[PDB]
Amino acid sequence: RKKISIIGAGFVGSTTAHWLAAKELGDIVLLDIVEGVPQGKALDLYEASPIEGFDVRVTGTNNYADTANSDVIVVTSGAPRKPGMSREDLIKVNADITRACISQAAPLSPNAVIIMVNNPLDAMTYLAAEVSGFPKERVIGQAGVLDAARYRTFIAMEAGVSVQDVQAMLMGGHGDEMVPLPRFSTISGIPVSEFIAPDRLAQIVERTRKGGGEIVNLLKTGSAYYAPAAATAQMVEAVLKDKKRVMPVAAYLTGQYGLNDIYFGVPVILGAGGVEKILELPLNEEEMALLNASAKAVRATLDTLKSL
Amino acid sequence: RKKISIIGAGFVGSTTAHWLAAKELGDIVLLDIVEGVPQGKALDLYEASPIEGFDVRVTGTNNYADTANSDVIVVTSGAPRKPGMSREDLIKVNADITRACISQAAPLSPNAVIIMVNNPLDAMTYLAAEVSGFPKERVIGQAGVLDAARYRTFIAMEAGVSVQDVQAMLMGGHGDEMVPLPRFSTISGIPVSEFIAPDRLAQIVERTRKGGGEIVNLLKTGSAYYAPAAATAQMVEAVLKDKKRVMPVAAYLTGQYGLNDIYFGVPVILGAGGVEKILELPLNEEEMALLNASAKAVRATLDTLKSL
Amino acid sequence: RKKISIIGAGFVGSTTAHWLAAKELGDIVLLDIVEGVPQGKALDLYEASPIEGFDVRVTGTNNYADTANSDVIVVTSGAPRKPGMSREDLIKVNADITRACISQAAPLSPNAVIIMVNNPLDAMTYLAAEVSGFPKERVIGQAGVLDAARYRTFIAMEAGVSVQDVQAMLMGGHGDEMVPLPRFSTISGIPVSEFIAPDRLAQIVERTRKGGGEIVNLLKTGSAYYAPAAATAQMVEAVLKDKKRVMPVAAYLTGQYGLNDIYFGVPVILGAGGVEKILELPLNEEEMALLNASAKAVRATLDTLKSL
Amino acid sequence: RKKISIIGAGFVGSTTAHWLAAKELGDIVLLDIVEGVPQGKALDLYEASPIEGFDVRVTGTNNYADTANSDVIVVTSGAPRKPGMSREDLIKVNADITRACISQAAPLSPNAVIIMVNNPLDAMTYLAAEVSGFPKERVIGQAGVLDAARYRTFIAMEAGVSVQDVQAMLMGGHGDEMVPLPRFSTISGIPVSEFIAPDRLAQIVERTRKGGGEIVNLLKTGSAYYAPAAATAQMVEAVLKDKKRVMPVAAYLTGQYGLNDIYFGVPVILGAGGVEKILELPLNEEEMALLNASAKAVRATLDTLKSL
Ligand SMILES: NC(=O)c1ccc[n+]([C@@H]2O[C@H](COP(=O)([O-])OP(=O)(O)OC[C@H]3O[C@@H](n4cnc5c(N)ncnc54)[C@H](O)[C@@H]3O)[C@@H](O)[C@H]2O)c1
Ligand SMILES: NC(=O)c1ccc[n+]([C@@H]2O[C@H](COP(=O)([O-])OP(=O)(O)OC[C@H]3O[C@@H](n4cnc5c(N)ncnc54)[C@H](O)[C@@H]3O)[C@@H](O)[C@H]2O)c1
Ligand SMILES: NC(=O)c1ccc[n+]([C@@H]2O[C@H](COP(=O)([O-])OP(=O)(O)OC[C@H]3O[C@@H](n4cnc5c(N)ncnc54)[C@H](O)[C@@H]3O)[C@@H](O)[C@H]2O)c1
Ligand SMILES: NC(=O)c1ccc[n+]([C@@H]2O[C@H](COP(=O)([O-])OP(=O)(O)OC[C@H]3O[C@@H](n4cnc5c(N)ncnc54)[C@H](O)[C@@H]3O)[C@@H](O)[C@H]2O)c1
Ligand SMILES: O=C(O)/C=C\C(=O)O
Ligand SMILES: O=C(O)/C=C\C(=O)O
Numbered sequence A, B, C, D: 001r002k003k004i005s006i007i008g009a010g011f012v013g014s015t016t017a018h019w020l021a022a023k024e025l026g027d028i029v030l031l032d033i034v035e036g037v038p039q040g041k042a043l044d045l046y047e048a049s050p051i052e053g054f055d056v057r058v059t060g061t062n063n064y065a066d067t068a069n070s071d072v073i074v075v076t077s078g079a080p081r082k083p084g085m086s087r088e089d090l091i092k093v094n095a096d097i098t099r100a101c102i103s104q105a106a107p108l109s110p111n112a113v114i115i116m117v118n119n120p121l122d123a124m125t126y127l128a129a130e131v132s133g134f135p136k137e138r139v140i141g142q143a144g145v146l147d148a149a150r151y152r153t154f155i156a157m158e159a160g161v162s163v164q165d166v167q168a169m170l171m172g173g174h175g176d177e178m179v180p181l182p183r184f185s186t187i188s189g190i191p192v193s194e195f196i197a198p199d200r201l202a203q204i205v206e207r208t209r210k211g212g213g214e215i216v217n218l219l220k221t222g223s224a225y226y227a228p229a230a231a232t233a234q235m236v237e238a239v240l241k242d243k244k245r246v247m248p249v250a251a252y253l254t255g256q257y258g259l260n261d262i263y264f265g266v267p268v269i270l271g272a273g274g275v276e277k278i279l280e281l282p283l284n285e286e287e288m289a290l291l292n293a294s295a296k297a298v299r300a301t302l303d304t305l306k307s308l
């Protein structure tokens, strides 16, 4: 069976194990720094297997040696933000955690595809590629799928249609400056502008950008995890099953959109080889303006990373 | 449990029972004119239930009384075409069969939504609405979902991407003049023109229109059934689960697109109430030209129907 | 669509929403006494639908009015235990909570099947029946499905066989006195005793009885929720899809096994009518002695309850 | 992705492709000696993927080269029986077909587990092992899973319980002498004898033994395929996902139950290695007498085979 290691057994990591187990994609290793916690969660989820019918071994651990030879590594060890904070506010604590986790797991699973989740996503993904030395296409960040998911949800709600018929591309850093693209948003191939008034659609773009913060202010003591885990799981699936999904993920740019040497949210073809292709869309001036402002927020992020 | 009656237990009908059983949407009644056949197929499929785990009763019958009080009626009793024939060539034999089936089932399930499949689809759907006297929104034809499915498949194959990320609208009668709409075709919200060259995309539109015939010439003694049944099943699901799907189905027009008093392939919101809304897309001159030529092929079809 | 209200949006409650939403069994209402928390979890789970493909409306609230007319009501508002505690230690606090919850929810959904989860399970279920005034067969407690799930998992692990081919019955109160039944445990119809040595099987039985405490000790800050939620979801599913599941649940007894006026873990037929029949197994002397010790324990909690 | 080749794109073969594709277990190659037929069915099934959401490449062919390097090989190229015939009557025709198929497919996929379906099952499986020269545990026949499926269905119908809670073992050749085992039949761990009266259970046993003939008589032009394909698919799944399923299949014996040098229906552990272990049940005298009569029958087909 395929092997999937999830570094960090908190809300996003455990919930990610849940979505993955149900899919019976492969055995799962939940690792954490805290003792007992990952063992408890992994056993609890394993105990649900007779009810649901999936045959996947779910083991909790505190030993990186158990993650050896993984096909995919999911990193959800980062600390989450609390109300009043930005994802960028976590860069110091999470740069340390990220370096620590990657330096230990990466060497034990050289052929694995690493999927980062820790925030600030784009920066942490750059860090992981640096600490691991893995080919850039095998080191990616989860952000786009989640952001576009919130976007697609608000659209289905607004238009009163099935979430299964809504598609939408969204680019840029995983932050306030993310770029949801109405012009690249459709319902069964039909532009969403045909279902939603511009003003209403503007409010949706805005809510999308502030989506994470909306949850934080509701939960009060935590950050979102259901949609995040689903997004992460879908990416793991795309790789394990070589589905050739077209989705927005934080990938390493070498000139696309006039951007070089950065991990940025762009549309890609995700498969068994990780990012198998980065798509270069014909964005217009307004779109590029928004993208550039996002590429700038990200670079700012990388410069902070540099001084840590 | 919900009740679904499938009139006509041949390739499309039995295969439709298969897709539906697996979904555990409701009990299924397979009816046929031939003795034994529907009983055999329904028992054979019922015997698969312990293997797959679905709890749905699947019963074969030759008695319309067993279909009473159905929530949905699927009509797949029509005779299929053989190589060298057009779907229109079946209108005489199938008008008789259709009238016969509808006159017997309709009265026994007054609150049911009827989903026609018999060809020529658009005409047979008009006939069913006439013979049943059911509100027009509760009498619809399956065609668009299937046609667009073939279309979406050729696109995924061409672009080398996941069928799960391809969306595409297709309108008009279910025949040679159907209108696949490249401009309303997307991959994760991105126009398909960004993935396929125009000439290649033209060949896909063509293959789509002749899709059914392609299968017929391969099977030699029969017509397609896997995709057709899947399409039909998805529509049954949309109704039973009130999913508010946005899809192309043969619906009754009263002015939309400048067309009145005809069943025609148009984009609709399909839910518990059947066609809950017909969408009027801003098609351009070239698109309208193709649509009008299709609306003309359909009317021709209705005029033939009139003389039967 | 079917309507399901979950009272108490904590670990088990929210995870139940997750299992349920994935099955697309109906709209879910997550209620809690804490503002924001339910809304956040509901929205977050809702935002995952575009990724998973399920059309379910998940709404969070602090207002019981929103639970009105539910098909099923899940009660997971009880305080969980911490290491060193017995489920019974929660009887006073959870008796108040359970009473508060039932008295407000029951009246608004008189036709709903109430599924209790709050601990101590057996006593709380009895209190619900008493407070709701509902028909006994429509007020049941989840416990046996979870307990048997743990038992079946240990069996699968020990035997090295798919968890899909393992069935196991277990009865009694949801506590230490719990009674798993090796004699009524099979793998593809074959007695487990044929797969697991007596000493080892005895260990599995003991681990099953303390399986909950095991998790509480590993987590240290809370109790299990993945399996508990999967079990609670499977019961909801049994009711809504009228599957006639043969499973152990806390049902009201009137003489079965020689026990009267008590909610106790017993094998039942679960369907749209709730507990449709209480099975009466021919238990030997060994099993009955154990069962009676368990009954004695449950009775004790009731004496405590009736004196609160 | 995993590769699965299905030799013989008829009723069972194509339906297996359908069950398989829906599980998204790997690419499927449908081969047949008749031109066009496999290509048509493959394309039609492929065109359903956009509707169902599965990314599986289904290709039809008349060239064995396309089956090279398959993980699993399903053989469904045998001629089916018509009413009034016994499966054994097909031995001469199907011996030639089976020999032709194996000798061409085996060499191209030396590491594949071969799953036979052609009738008479037991004898054809033996012929495959002989022609392929493969390790006995990697050449198995489907039969018991189907037979037990029918048996389990009848049990569920009679008892009025979910087919999910019914397990039942059954052994012997795939023919009239077939041996279902009431003693090794349970519902959530409880003996079926507790649910079904002896006379009725005896009727279910007889119906199971003739369940195939029953379908052939109802269809009149062919034999069963929905359950047969579901069973064959569950075995393929067991192998590819290494689930360690406990199920009855035609495995090579070397003394178990006192039988040597014969493929016979016996309970095994099915995993990535094919038959990983042959379980040896403690059958009583009644059961053994029946088992021996069955063995006598299978042996007779082998004598016929060895003289072809
Ligand atoms: N990219 C996205 O779209 C997205 C979505 C949600 C959350 N996130 C981010 O993901 C991270 C996880 O969020 P969460 O809510 O699950 O948090 P959490 O606090 O619940 O879980 C993090 C887990 O990491 C563990 N941990 C800490 N240091 C570790 C180390 N060195 N090694 C292994 N494990 C370690 C903790 O003990 C904890 O169990 C946060 O940084 C959050 O902001 C990103
Ligand atoms: N709308 C689409 O997209 C679409 C797709 C595929 C097929 N079709 C059409 O659907 C029909 C069925 O195709 P098929 O391949 O399943 O055919 P088929 O010949 O296999 O099956 C038709 C079944 O109808 C039964 N039947 C005949 N008269 C009947 C009556 N009066 N009452 C009840 N049952 C009766 C037959 O005995 C037969 O079992 C054809 O007309 C075909 O052209 C439409
Ligand atoms: N029966 C079983 O098999 C089983 C399995 C697991 C847990 N449990 C029990 O289930 C309960 C819930 O466990 P948990 O881990 O989810 O706990 P939790 O503390 O995470 O969640 C309980 C939720 O109830 C809410 N709540 C409290 N009073 C309320 C009121 N009056 N109305 C509405 N909501 C209210 C809280 O605010 C909280 O969000 C506990 O009593 C636990 O012991 C039983
Ligand atoms: N073992 C079981 O439990 C079980 C269950 C059902 C059917 N069966 C048996 O399975 C076989 C298939 O049944 P069916 O109903 O699908 O039959 P079918 O006639 O529909 O299909 C058989 C297919 O084999 C093809 N074929 C013939 N010779 C071939 C060759 N040399 N190479 C490649 N393909 C070739 C045919 O052209 C045909 O498409 C029969 O022998 C039947 O008795 C066994
Ligand atoms: O808001 C957060 O911190 C996490 C969710 C997200 O990244 O969107
Ligand atoms: O070609 C046919 O007759 C049927 C399939 C379809 O309607 O596309």
Ligand SMILES: O=C(O)/C=C\C(=O)O
Binding pocket: C080, C081, C087, C119, C146, C174, C211, C212, C213, C216, C223, C224, C228
């Ligand atoms: O032990 C607990 O409190 C919860 C899990 C269970 O009841 O099994």
Ligand SMILES: O=C(O)/C=C\C(=O)O
Binding pocket: D080, D081, D087, D119, D146, D174, D211, D212, D213, D216, D223, D224, D228
């Ligand atoms: O009876 C047949 O020929 C096929 C079905 C089976 O073997 O059970």
